[PDB]
Ligand binder design. Sequence first.
Ligand SMILES: [Ca+2]
Ligand SMILES: [Cl-]
Lengths: 309, 298, 289
Amino acid sequence: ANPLYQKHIISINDLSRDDLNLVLATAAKLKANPQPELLKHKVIASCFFEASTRTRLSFETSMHRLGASVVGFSDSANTSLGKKGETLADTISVISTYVDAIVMAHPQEGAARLATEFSGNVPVLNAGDGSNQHPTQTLLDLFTIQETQGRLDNLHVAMVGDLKYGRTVHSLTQALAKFDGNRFYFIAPDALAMPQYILDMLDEKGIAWSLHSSIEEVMAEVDILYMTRVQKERLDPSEYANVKAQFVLRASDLHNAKANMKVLHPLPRVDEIATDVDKTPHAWYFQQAGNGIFARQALLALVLNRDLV
Amino acid sequence: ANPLYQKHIISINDLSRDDLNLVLATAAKLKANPQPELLKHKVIASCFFEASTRTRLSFETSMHRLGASVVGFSDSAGETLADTISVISTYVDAIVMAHPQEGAARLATEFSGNVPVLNAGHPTQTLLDLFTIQETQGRLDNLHVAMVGDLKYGRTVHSLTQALAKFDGNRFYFIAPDALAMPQYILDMLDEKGIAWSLHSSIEEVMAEVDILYMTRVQKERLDPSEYANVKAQFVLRASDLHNAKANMKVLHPLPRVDEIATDVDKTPHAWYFQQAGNGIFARQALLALVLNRDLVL
Amino acid sequence: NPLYQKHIISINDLSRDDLNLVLATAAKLKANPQPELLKHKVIASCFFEASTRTRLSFETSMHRLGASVVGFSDSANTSLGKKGETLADTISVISTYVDAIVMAHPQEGAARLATEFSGNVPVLNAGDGSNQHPTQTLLDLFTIQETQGRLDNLHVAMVGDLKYGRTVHSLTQALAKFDGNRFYFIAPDALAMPQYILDMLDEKGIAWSLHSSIEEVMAEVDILYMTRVQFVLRASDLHNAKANMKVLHPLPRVDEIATDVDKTPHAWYFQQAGNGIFARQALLALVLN
Ligand SMILES: [Ca+2]
Ligand SMILES: [Cl-]
């Protein structure tokens, strides 16, 4: 009855549409009736090998909102882990003898799937592995889309900025591609284009996507405008001309936006969303960030508790 | 109702006298009678953009003594700060922050929404100073208070002087190098209120009269090295200086100390800087409890 | 109990009876958890020296008993390097906040120095970054006791860097407080077990011998205790091992234990690390109740 019990959460690709809807339904229930003791007597490792203050504080808050305890580190440079040449595999194996679940973010794509080979029984939750996947960002993104659009089907969704290195949009496009009738607009520098493996997937599913050279040319029809930061720390040095944001959203761009349209951003932002956007009714990134608590609580509850909420 | 509920606490002098009295009464109540589940189901951010280890550990201990959960960062190892605050304020019930840049905490209050911001670096230092005085002397009025060291640039003695001047009948003794004197605008306020103060070049000459001796550093940057070499010993406290001390007298120091309190002071009955530091727990518990809990602890 | 409010700086300060009390308590807590035992305690996790595995193990143990934690995970991140911040004053202040202090520090004796300034507050030494500190030897002993059923009359082989792997020095001294144990030391000449350890065993009438390989003694060993050079064990070397034999390693390991050992029934270094939780729970419960 709880298909996420004790499941590793590494990639959206591994989750089903029903899985996504179950997390979202559980998040709305907990948002409505908190369960502050549900994970009492659990200890969870917050292992941010790659620092990400917003995501870690979101995850750790969600742990505490369910009554779990927390141990961990905020950056692998603040640790002695690996300093003698030992493997990440061994680090995970040892930590897995301590805790009831491992939340990990790591600079290398695939590191979270590697961890699942060595964690024995303990679930690994991928809080972001380099430029690859970010499945819990997608879960809070979907909860937010569901909340503001009333549905996850038949949406016009624009994704802007660094689509190549953006783990956020890899996971979110895969998830939305599990629903029906969605239409994608990709607005990105040529060098930071959405990768081919995402495009082939949409093709094989018969899902329409197209490339666009401006936000304005798609503004009138988008329901969700998903903005991203250039992943400066992941760019190849030959991609240095792409560090500066090529597409900037300003309040004036919203003059012909649909009444229901919301602008999302996984955050942090550089200048791709000007601060005059913050005051409009379309700005929804901080609401989105707040919904991460409910999405991440839901996931933690479903993974760590045998039965449903 | 509780007048500090959901209030930002950025500066000590934003506190009315009634609110100061409320904090101090609440600290005393919690110290005598702990309330270990008061902040159960609260999550508090401990946001130390620049490390301030002793202050962070004190604040976080205070959170746990009240049953609250804690998330944060202990060190970073304007536009982003605004967004950082906006994001964290969607997670937590209160933000405790230390930040080295001018105006950072007040700017945080513009972007935290309904989430109160508590400045850790600062208001809780003057609060724990006052709490420690009130607890060791039984009152905050009609005291003899000596302050020693860099009285010109020390913000902590300025705040303590200003706060103690809101109580009646205190007599002040300022003991400082001539170049680091208590500034005129403080003196002017004491003058106009009829509060007696005097200057003294030695700790010993007022030791017989003082209830609180509040010690601070005289840093080498402040004086010429020829002057520093001749003057510093006048502002160093040694155990032998305490010969004529009243039995109630307490030696305070906001910490860290360098050499201005010799270690032989540490085991006299008058040394009280470590107990004062421990009182930060109760001062910080009080502020957290009043800001975060709608109802007063009865 | 005799450990109440006591500093735990060095395992050699513990008698045989003290070791038994910790191990018995560890076993009791493993059998029947006590999740609220240290409810309303706040414990300081002061890792001046990072030692992250030991830190995570210690903090998990605190949480499994219901205590709260404050601390820092490396000196470099703190303000304890600024002028006037001394270790003595830092401990003096922290001991007004917390109910106990767990501390690792890069300099030898740092934890013992801290007991001079912590007042009534117990200090628990977590080492200098290495695996020599009391709870490591306690979890080693707990793991030997649990798997072998005893701490007496064992055949213990210690392999690797026996000169600088000080945890083998502690473990040998601890096991020499028990009865009838026999030691096999397998190490290069430059990294051989220190003479002061051999003399100690001699004084106790405890048998030991040096061996050039582990195949020489494998059929008789009960515990194979491996160390990292501050002699590579492979799955095929275990063919003639006794059914009770267990391979231990304080960790981290590099190449001295090939990963094909991990799947064999004798690999026990990750179970051993897991036992850190119960040894550390036990120490904290006894020191604070
Ligand atoms: Ca525009
Ligand atoms: Cl993947």
